[PDB]
Amino acid sequence: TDLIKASKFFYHYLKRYKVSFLFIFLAIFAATYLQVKAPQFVGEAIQELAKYAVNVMQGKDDKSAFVSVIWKLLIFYVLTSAASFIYSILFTQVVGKSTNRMRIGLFNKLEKLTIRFFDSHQDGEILSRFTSDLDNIQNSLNQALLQVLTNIALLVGVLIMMFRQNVELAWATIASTPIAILIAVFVISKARKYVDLQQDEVGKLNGYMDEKISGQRVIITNGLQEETIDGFLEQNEKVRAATYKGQVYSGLLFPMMQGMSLVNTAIVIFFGGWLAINGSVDRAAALGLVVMFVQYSQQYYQPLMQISSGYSMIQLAVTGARRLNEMFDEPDEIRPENGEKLEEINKAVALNHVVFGYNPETPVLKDVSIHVDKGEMVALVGPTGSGKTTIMNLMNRFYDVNEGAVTFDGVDIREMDLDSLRSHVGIVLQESVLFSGTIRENIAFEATDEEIVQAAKQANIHEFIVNLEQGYDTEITNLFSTGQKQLVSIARTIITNPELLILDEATSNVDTVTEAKIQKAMDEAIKGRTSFVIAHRLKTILNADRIIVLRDGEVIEEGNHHELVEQDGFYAELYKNQ
Amino acid sequence: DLIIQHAKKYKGSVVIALLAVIVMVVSALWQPKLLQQVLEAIMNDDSDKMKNLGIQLIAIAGLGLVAGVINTIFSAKVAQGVSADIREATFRKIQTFSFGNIEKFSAGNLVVRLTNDVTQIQNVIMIALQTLFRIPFLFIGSFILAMLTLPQLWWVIVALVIAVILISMLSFSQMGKHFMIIQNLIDKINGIAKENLLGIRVVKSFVQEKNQLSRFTKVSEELTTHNLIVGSLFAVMIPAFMLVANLAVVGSIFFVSNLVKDDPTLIGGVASFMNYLMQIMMAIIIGGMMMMMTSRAAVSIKRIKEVMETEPDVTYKKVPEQELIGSVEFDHVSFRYTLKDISFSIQPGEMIGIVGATGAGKSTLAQLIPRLFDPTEGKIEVGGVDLREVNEHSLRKTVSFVLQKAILFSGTIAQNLRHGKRDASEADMERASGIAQAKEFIEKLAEGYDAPVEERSNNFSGGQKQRLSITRGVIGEPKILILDDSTSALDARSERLVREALDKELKETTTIVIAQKISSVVHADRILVLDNGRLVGEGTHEELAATNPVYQEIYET
């Protein structure tokens, strides 16, 4: 089934180039035909050269027939070069355009609502899905696919023209095919197995390495030299055998098939001479046939060598195509033209009997019903990480709940446009990763220039931008401190200036002074907008207008800090850390 | 030279591999000579000679076949041997560096040049033994033999090699000129994909995803032009090569007719001659391709060379030292990442805290007590012995230093705890845990101390990470312990417990405490203050409450 899936993958993109992809078939057919009768003409040419010689012995002919056949052969070779020119160029052009199309296709599909895929699959695996499989397809189409097609066409043509030329000699010369194909299948299969094992083992090794070469500081402090080197050496010994086998069986194929070509030309020589001396008396025709068949054997195993070599590329390519097809069948889940395009929240945000979890079984939250008002804010706290952080995931409708409703004024999240939603509501997430370019790009992530100054001042970070060289124009993509990443994220959100804001525990790794700077940044963020906040350090948002506390996704208490402390509860216990 | 320096170990297999290469080449170069001989015998009609030459030819063909397998297997043996040896040597060098020498390069740079380059050079040397040495001897042998068999055609060989050299020059220019840029662009595409993916949360948080897609599509579009250019280059050269070879063969057939008058046996040569001619064309083109690919090998070997050769910042000196007395003193120290004129002294059985401006070498001065850094000016003597005088054995077995960041390694937590002491029994293990107040927390795990830990340690949160780190620090019960703001992430419930536990194991112990939180420092007997490389003063919490101005603008918080 994998072959069919990969073929469908290719088809989906190659459809848009049908006429050219069909014309190249005629081009290659003509090219192979011309390249396949060339040995016939060179053989006839040497035959006529022998005839010219024997005439020179007594007659001294005008070599007119020889000259004519050389004319034919030279013209055919030139036109062969022309055919190669044309189909190579056209194939390259179509491959380039198709590769661009499918690369943009993978990207576009990625930026659909496949949020669940990223949520479940580890980052490394999904990045691999791209950088290994699609790049393998790219390499295959760049160099692999044309080789196999050209070579198989050459193979069929040369077989047909052998049988048109001679019967017994060709029926014998191809007799080496079963041995060669057995060699190829065995070696390539064992190479696949052993190289996969080698890749696994070297992955384990380089993972051990990566981790040690990252933590070496503690090693130096405590002198773990001997133990770490011993473990590295043991894994190195394992990969020693692994890579020995893998490398040998990977590199064996090409020389093995070359030697097979040697023995093939040898055996065809043997039968050619035997037929020539013991068979037809017309030695001139005999030797012409012999040299012709030598050329044929070379041009026959060249396809076999090329296809066998490209087998490794193409098989892995089609497996990667299977993976990309699995991706391409993932539901986009984009919302339709739902009509409603929110322009202003109206300041009546709330939740209604919300039940949700990563998957329907064992929901992490149940019956969540909270409301928020004009420029108001709500403080949240409960079980660490999941169980409380998840509610935000629904607030942006990253996921969609099975049942229960959330709205900003009556209208449920399912109603309005996703784009308008994301535009009108901002989110700040713990890690707060950055992007390529300059800090100006990261703040803009927008069609705004001077608003960055106001935002950075509001983000209490402007001093830090001006501190660096060329200020906002400082390229970045490392070399940047921790809290300032979150500060940049806050600045980004405020320049977005959405109606509603949601923030997590922004004080994950920061000092008290940076914490206070983050706090005044919060004040700036909340001062003008309604906002939710997830807080584990209660001191951060002690001045919350209203406070919510969660059991494992169930609201258990609510109210003001003073209300929630004069009212005995889990909130007071948590506060009692101070 | 480094590759051969290492391969001296496998020269024994290298020689046999090269001999295998040689035999393969000589067989492949004779078989067309024997082709000429046999079809010449057909011309001369010697049945017994025909049979003898045929059997010789098939035998030599099989000999070349087996030469192929032996060549590849032993070339692989040498290649893997050199790769393993060089990776091991580099790993040893890395582990023998000083922390500064490690800082000379980024961890990503270390890992990439340690894993990608090593395999790149392994594959390169594989191709080198299996292929490279084949091309030059193949080329010269084909040249000389073809000259021998058809001397009158000597010039056409020169013409063909000239033409192929011309087109190969065009390639060696344009293809590289475009290969560098397309490699950079393909790397750029993967980089932007990485950045977008990890940010998918924020990217989808904004409609800017559409513009990000437009940017990615633009970049791919520039990639398209270069890809089309290189495709055109293929479509020009490959037809160009095939055309030149075919034209040379046909010209060989055509011009030989001008000399057959006085010698017809040249009919016998012509076929083997064209075979040799195609052979030499293929040999030169593949040699050019492999020479071009050799540039990456050159870059990789250059990159690995410097890391291999670089010497450390710290060195052994003279004799192993006595047991550390337990005192620490500074003598007008200076350092550049930074520090200058630093001086202070603390005696056995005392506690002191350090505080300074954020980012103003948050922990570097403390990091200097470990010899991983060296005082550029001045000196420090710990226990009355200078850093230049002490040897690493005593430092580790008498001093410890919790890093500014928590670090864990794959496997079990028990081994990571054992990092501090090789033979720390379990009993000492839970003693350290209780000192860090982790016994119950660890008990909550699947097994406990032997429970597993992720490679990145993502199955535990930051607080218990700090706790594990401090346990590792205290397991050895060293005379000197350095505590660096380990309380700045966990819950504000166990800082009192950890400081209290330190306040009972303090016997015969002196510790340095670093943090921006004076709260954890108030329990310190003494305190030192620093500001951007300048020592502010020495004293105590209450005394500095009025003595120095820097105290107040942190104390108010």
Partner: nanobody
Framework: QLVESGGGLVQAGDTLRLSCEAS?????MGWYRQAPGKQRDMVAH???????RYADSVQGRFTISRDNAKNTVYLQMNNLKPEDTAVYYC????????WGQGTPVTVS
């Protein structure tokens, strides 16, 4: 082209050395014969190197020789019998069988 001399009247039991020369041509040579009314048929062959092969009818009696210095060939008739009477030719060729005019020998 070729040239052969030596043939003539002989008796059953006589000895005659045939001698043929090539027009600057270097070849594997051999002698053929034609009995009156019979087809051209092989008699013996001498390889360019120097080794040879004879027809059973003449095996053990007739001897062939050549001189590579000039590509001349010889064949020693000896112990003749009446059936040996025929016209003989010297042959040396590459593809098309070059043969000389040949000469007759009559075994009386």
């Amino acid at each position: 082209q070729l040239v052969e001399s030596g043939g003539g009247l002989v008796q059953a039991g006589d000895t005659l050395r045939l001698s043929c020369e090539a027009s600057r041509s270097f070849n594997r040579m051999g002698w053929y014969r034609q009995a009156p009314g019979k087809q051209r048929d092989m008699v013996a062959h001498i390889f360019s190197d120097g080794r040879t092969r004879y027809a059973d009818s003449v095996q053990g009696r007739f001897t062939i020789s050549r001189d590579n210095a000039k590509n001349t060939v010889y064949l020693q008739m000896n112990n003749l019998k009446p059936e040996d009477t025929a016209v003989y030719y010297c042959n040396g060729f590459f593809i098309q069988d070059f043969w000389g005019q040949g000469t007759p020998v009559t075994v009386s």
